[PDB]
From a paper:
The yeast lipid flippase [name]-[name] is primarily found in the trans-Golgi network and is involved in protein trafficking between that network, the plasma membrane, and endosomes. [name] belongs to a large family of Type IV P-type ATPases (P4 ATPases).
We obtained the activated complex by incubating the purified sample with 26 μM [name] for 15 h at 4 °C, resulting in a cryo-EM structure determined at 3.3 Å resolution. We found that in vitro activation by [name] was a very slow process; incubating the protein for a shorter period, say, 1-2 h, led to a mixture of activated and inactive conformations. Notably, the A domain, previously stabilized by the last stretch of the ordered inhibitory C-terminal peptide, has moved about 6 Å away from the P domain and has become partially flexible, as indicated by its weakened EM density.
Author numbering:
A (entry chain E): 21 to 359
B (entry chain A): 196 to 583, 597 to 1241
The structure:
Amino acid sequence: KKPPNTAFRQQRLKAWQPILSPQSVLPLLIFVACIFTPIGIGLIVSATKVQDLTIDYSHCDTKASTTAFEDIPKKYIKYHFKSKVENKPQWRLTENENGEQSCELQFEIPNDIKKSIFIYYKITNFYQNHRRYVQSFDTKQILGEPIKKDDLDTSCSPIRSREDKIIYPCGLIANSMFNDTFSQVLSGIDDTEDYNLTNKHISWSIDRHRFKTTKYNASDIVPPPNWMKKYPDGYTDENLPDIHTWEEFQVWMRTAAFPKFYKLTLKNESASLPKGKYQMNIELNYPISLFGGTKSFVLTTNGAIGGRNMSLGVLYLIVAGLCALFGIIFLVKLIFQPR
Amino acid sequence: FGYSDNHISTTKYNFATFLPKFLFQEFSKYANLFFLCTSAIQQVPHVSPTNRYTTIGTLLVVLIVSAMKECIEDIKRANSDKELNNSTAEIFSEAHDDFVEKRWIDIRVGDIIRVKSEEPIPADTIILSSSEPEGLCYIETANLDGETNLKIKQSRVETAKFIDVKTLKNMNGKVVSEQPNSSLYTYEGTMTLNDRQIPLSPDQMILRGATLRNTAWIFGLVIFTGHETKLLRNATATPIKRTAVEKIINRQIIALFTVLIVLILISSIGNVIMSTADAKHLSYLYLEGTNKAGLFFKDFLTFWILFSNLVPISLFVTVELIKYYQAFMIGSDLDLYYEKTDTPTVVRTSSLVEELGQIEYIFSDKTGTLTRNIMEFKSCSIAGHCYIGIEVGYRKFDDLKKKLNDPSDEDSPIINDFLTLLATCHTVIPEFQSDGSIKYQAASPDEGALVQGGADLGYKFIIRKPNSVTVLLEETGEEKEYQLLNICEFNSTRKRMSAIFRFPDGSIKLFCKGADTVILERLDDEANQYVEATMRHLEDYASEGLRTLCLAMRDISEGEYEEWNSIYNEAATTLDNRAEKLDEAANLIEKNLILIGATAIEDKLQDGVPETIHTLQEAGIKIWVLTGDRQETAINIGMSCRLLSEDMNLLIINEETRDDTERNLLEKINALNEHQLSTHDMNTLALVIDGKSLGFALEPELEDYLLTVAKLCKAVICCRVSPLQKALVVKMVKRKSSSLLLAIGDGANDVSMIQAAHVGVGISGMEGMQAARSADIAVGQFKFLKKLLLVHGSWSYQRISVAILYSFYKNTALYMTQFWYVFANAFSGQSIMESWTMSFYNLFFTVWPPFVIGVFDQFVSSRLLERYPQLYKLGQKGQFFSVYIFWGWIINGFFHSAIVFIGTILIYRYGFALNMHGELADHWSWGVTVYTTSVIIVLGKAALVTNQWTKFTLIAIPGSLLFWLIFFPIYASIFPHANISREYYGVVKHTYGSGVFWLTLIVLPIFALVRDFLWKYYKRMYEPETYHVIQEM
Ligand SMILES: *[C@@H]1O[C@H](CO)[C@@H](O[C@@H]2O[C@H](CO)[C@@H](O)[C@H](O)[C@H]2NC(C)=O)[C@H](O)[C@H]1NC(C)=O
Ligand SMILES: *[C@@H]1O[C@H](CO)[C@@H](O)[C@H](O)[C@H]1NC(C)=O
Ligand SMILES: *[C@@H]1O[C@H](CO)[C@@H](O)[C@H](O)[C@H]1NC(C)=O
């Protein structure tokens, strides 16, 4: 029969139409560029406001000093403070046969940084984002459930089992974690602060709900083969790692996206960092030869963006340039072309 | 015995056989079998980078939507089969009394059925008797043959007496019948009713889909039923026609499979190079798998699953869902609906809506499509006179004065015999009505136009028995008794028909009519007195475009009626050749006639036809018209229906058996060596062909030989064409020089012509129905082809082209970030996003932007898409959709994808982009950052390739952004506590709680819509095209 005569059915719907007259494209480009310049300038302000420090300490064992604080190469430290550094930072190696090549880095904070300070470790060329690497952890076995053999997640397969025993932190993430132990204290030398840090409230809040202490009897389980060295007798009822308490496991388990990643170890938020000379002692357990690249430690603050990355501010400036480069070409070509 | 059901076999599935046939129909394709084999390879352990139920999940959803659309349409099919199937069948009870009201399902071998009037016949029956005493019955073939002549269904004489219920209780016998072959006019059957030999002729052969019109009841001995009849065994499967947009979807998917295997070769060869170069520095993966080619195979599968969504699953199900919805939107159109015949412009093939937008070679029937099949009696060359303005309506009152002046008019008995011929000699059947008039069962519309043309002057034809007397109704007198003595029927090569009549005074005279070249050769006309006037008024009628016949009479004496009654009676007993001996006899008495005059009924062109043909020719379409008419009348048609403009070339070709090389080669010479300006020589070119000349032209020796002069003209008209060369013209043009056709008819001789085009069109309305069923679009009138073809061709072609092309863009622009991340990681095969927003992207968020582009996108308004038919030429030539524009939209996908990847690498540099505490944006927070940014660039490009877009597309283009931004805290807050996506722990707090996440969503999508937005502003202000100008006119 007769189809209905609604506005929808007869393709007669109400429709505004975007006409690209230069009376509505030129104010769009002038408006977009003129609204992305204060935020691009504002975010380069809040991306150069941070005052970080980054010391590559990979070549501290072979490039060592072992007797006194000698000077550092220029290619390692990348400081970006507000004031200027008077005395360039030194470092040395120590070996007390228990620390096994701990590394005293010694840096000079030029002015008292006022924001909350955060000490990371940067690792370059560590593919933490491999397909066989963001898997290979049993999710139940880090929830604390005593999962038996052959009920484990098989993604742990090479670090899954051992001599008729299972590995409690199975898989590729839990094994081979960054075990260089930073000193909890920034040791203020020449009587400035003797500055304390914490390794608490470091991980994600949802990792501290998902990572729970285990329920195994500590005799069926065995530690993974790389940090079998810190547990040479094996797991016992006393030395067993409480994962909910550890809180550096669960910054390494939260795998970062890239081969060039920071990972948080230490921070302080309730006190400023004064302008003295500090030293930090870093026990070199984690070899370079395992992964490929460098391993610095980072002493940074936060801005609007996280730390010193001007790429989003200049990435607003390329937009506010290209909305005022073609916003002038498409006005010179609006006046001089019908001229 | 165990016969089938009563349904026309347009069936797709059955309730048990649904799964192998439907899964073979979907999994016989390429873009569903690809995801079947990636889902089957994806079940290998430690190989799936995403999940298993991701790809088998969304492939399962696509198969459920395909079974939803196919299930709805085949349930509508079976609903029509219940509209035909449920029919009342009064069937005889062998045990108890009279015919009972049963359903169809009690029909078997040799069933005796009584079915009433104004309701369809169930199946093939044999007439034993009817309500008429002879046993013949009146019926029309609405579904069988298309010709609306009511058949005189004769019966066998020895069985016609069985009428009552008491009669056919001792009546049964075996009927060895014809084999079930589809010979319509051939039957062979025997019968032993009472151990007597009864032969069966094909005359008592009421077929399946007939509708009984005028009896009280008819009987029937059923022979064949189910799928065994002569109407349901030749049920054409109508094989599906791949359009001009989806052959290039086939090679377009071949192009994406090419770039896929390029990505997996570059990617996995990169995995061998890095996985064997960095072997010292990747000992924290424990890659002691010694099969390096085995890990090349496994990782090859990780990338063949990882990149596999570049080809989309929800395109070919989305294309068919859009194109069916365009088929719905065309069918629900007021401007395509002709309310007088009440036909709601249904589209039989929903997959060819795009095909409306490239049509170059529209073919057409003249009879009924252009000329409406209403035979109005316009003029008559009477007594060697006509109106020489046109005043034949007023001149006909001077014809009344020509009869009423009986004492002084020589012409008055001659016009008495004229009105006698167009009041008595016919093959039509009169029909009493409920009103105070009479309506004619027209066996021939020419004859009904003659008898009704006499009835306009007070000659009401009273009912005439075939073996009795008749009377008339004259206007001046009261009533006049005439006689049915002898009839001489019409034949093709005879080109005439005659009759022998008895006036009531005893003067038995001959009255003959027919074509000019036969009646104008067997005549005297009182030493050719009214022959030159007959010639020049035929040429007047050949100057006006009217269907014209000629009229004559002669005399029979008593001895010629006696001896010719003998030779005519024993000449009519022949069953060997009924059309040969009766016509040799029927021109033994057709010597030396006396010519009377001519008749001229008009076949008026329809309401919008010349404006339609003119505007279709302005759209760059080479409209042809195929007919069985002669030369000068069809040149008057094309001159009157805008096919033939003033001073057009008119290449006349009226050849013979071997006259081909003269006009064909010499019109190749005058078509090539006579090279005029070729712009005004093009638009003033035509070709007028005889179908007998065309009969030796549609042949593989001389086919392209005719196509070189055929394709050059603007409006090729063909004349006197047998209906086989309609289909040979359609196949001739689709086979060589493959353009996009369209064919129109309204008769059952057009089914081979409509079912062979690139898009067939049938015309409903008048006495034909086989065209509007066996078409791709059923259309009320020929004027609807203008707005449908131009308007909905441009609409459907642009909208489906940007819908398909945008869909390839959006899947390229998401999963190409999966390719650019292969360089970021260790060439591993790491999914950036979590497994289920992968399967929610191309199924659940960006499924609405291709839909509202494919349906609700007015790229140019219809009020000035048909005021400039030149715009149809830009859709016709092949703009808006190609392989070149396809790689333009892919590489727009690569640029937008790599700008999201590289931009978000440099924003989230070390992962350290948070200000909440010292926590870092991990893998998955960055993963939904590039996922969200890729959504905003994808519906940003969707917001830039739409125009005239407000209503149901502000629910789609920002509705997908806002629907994702609402869906993601709900999914990634509720669903990780269900062990289904344990990768979104804290990702809501570390993306939506981020400072730098919304900043990336603000500027970085703008940083690709600079190239998009300024390319769009550049190509409609400083380098425009035609439609870019017309969009503001
Ligand atoms: C710190 O981690 C490294 C590597 O993750 C450990 O080095 C491995 O120690 C085991 C047991 O001593 C050896 O079998 C491996 O060959 C070592 N891998 C190397 C050197 O690449 C190291 O022992 C850990 N230090 C601790 C736990 O104090
Ligand atoms: C921050 O440093 C000051 C001075 O070193 C110390 O007193 C305070 O406890 C520190 N806070 C934390 C949370 O470590
Ligand atoms: C603060 O620093 C001193 C330095 O030796 C240390 O002994 C003390 O435990 C620290 N306090 C903390 C970590 O709360």
